């Protein structure tokens, strides 16, 4: 499925510092685990 994400990867950094990405949900810590 890999549903897209509309929230920052880290929740403790202000959204002004969001640093827009291309992969969205594929960039979070969940994909750091990956396997």
């Amino acid at each position: 499925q890999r549903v897209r994400r509309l929230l920052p990867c880290d929740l403790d950094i202000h959204p002004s510092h969001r640093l827009l990405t291309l992969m969205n949900n594929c960039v979070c810590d969940g994909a750091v685990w990956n396997a």
């Binding site: 499925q1 897209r4 509309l6 929230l7 202000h14 959204p15 002004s16 827009l20």
Partner: protein, 551 residues
Amino acid sequence: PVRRLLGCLGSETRRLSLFLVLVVLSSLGEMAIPFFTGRLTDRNLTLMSILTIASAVLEFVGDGIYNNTMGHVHSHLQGEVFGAVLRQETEFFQQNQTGNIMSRVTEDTSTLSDSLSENLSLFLWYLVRGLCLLGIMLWGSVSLTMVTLITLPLLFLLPKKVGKWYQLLEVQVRESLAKSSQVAIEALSAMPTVRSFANEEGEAQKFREKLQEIKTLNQKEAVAYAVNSWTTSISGMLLKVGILYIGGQLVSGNLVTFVLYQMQFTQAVEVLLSIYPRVQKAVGSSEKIFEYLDRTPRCPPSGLLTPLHLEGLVQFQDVSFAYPNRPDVLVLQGLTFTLRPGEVTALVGPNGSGKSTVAALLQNLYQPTGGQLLLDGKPLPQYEHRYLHRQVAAVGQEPQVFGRSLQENIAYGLTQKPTMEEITAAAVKSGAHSFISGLPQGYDTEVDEAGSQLSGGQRQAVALARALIRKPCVLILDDATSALDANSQLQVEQLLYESPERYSRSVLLITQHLSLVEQADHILFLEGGAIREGGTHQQLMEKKGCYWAMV
């Protein structure tokens, strides 16, 4: 209580709405990416980059607008707090020290407006993102969204119950900071005296006690932070677990998308939950400034009487007074005397008999607690503030001199900058020109704080020049008789007793010495707050033999 924090913000209400529409547009543009490019595994790269660039530009514009609006709000609030502070009665500043007042004005406002700036945009952003996520989840599954929204209000109970504690804790922290600032200012302002008596370590220890009192509360703050961070995360995970259980009972293949959206809605809720304690802390911190902003002063409002011509007819009708902090003790007992233009009235008495209190009452600093005081047939509050303080001038027993150029100290408080000839005339009249012309920078010479650079009698001469530049109608002299030099004394006696401008003025000479009271038209003896004897020099001396100066 929270309504004040929104009332102080609701001045603009337009820039914030524009920022909100900009962030909504940015959120829509970010949400629109997959349906045009394709959901996964993607000529197609250009439009995606274009959308990302547009989102970045919109975010930049919104951030700039929000920052400018927040700066405007901060400046307005910080100015208005001080403007409200200056309106209080002169009694209020005996209860609150200057080192506490300026700490409240400068630090509390800059913390409240920083917290508001840091939290408002975050709250709006996560609110709109959570709304978009909920709108998607509604298409995902209606019933499960309903049960999630039903169980959502339960999580607010514990923060609501622990809400007040943050306010009462922050109030204590802020008051301890203000008390520490008071000690710091009191130690720094009087450094020569502290050095002379070698009490430096005493001041350090006294500051350290307040620092320790702050350190005691900071630990409880940290512990509350930690426990709140535990509880918010526990509730956030419980929210998703209690609906994963419902999905398991329900099993239906489309549940995967709805769960992947719920795991993001729950993080939005988790952030909004951590928003609340900071709102409570901000409400608690601003307790004193939102009391200053609306505390009604005890003084009567100023009138609007501005006669173009006035005569210094000052008379007292059974005036009695008592200082506010000790109202049970009457400082003055039924004084009654009259001043007239062209006459000089000398007030003479022992130390602590109430002479300076009479001077303060004449300057409308305090209101009488008995009888009535009238100026030209009108009570003092009926006059306009600026007009009253122009027509009545005084020299204090220890005149304050501000840290600016001597031409601005002499011309202090005037509605317009006088021409240099007027300042020269006043300085020559008061005798200050004997030493002003000797300074390397002349009238432009800078003055250190409280007049520390000036000598003894020079301060009295500058104060007299400052009083005379207004051409007052009633003149008060508390100590400009003793410290003056030989030339300034002759100038003072010339202006008091032989200058042509005498007949337009009435003078209240306050002095316990015989320096200039011999030539006064009336001598009033004030003992224990009550007038004992009155009359001219010969009339006063005849009834008591050697009345004073026995040796």
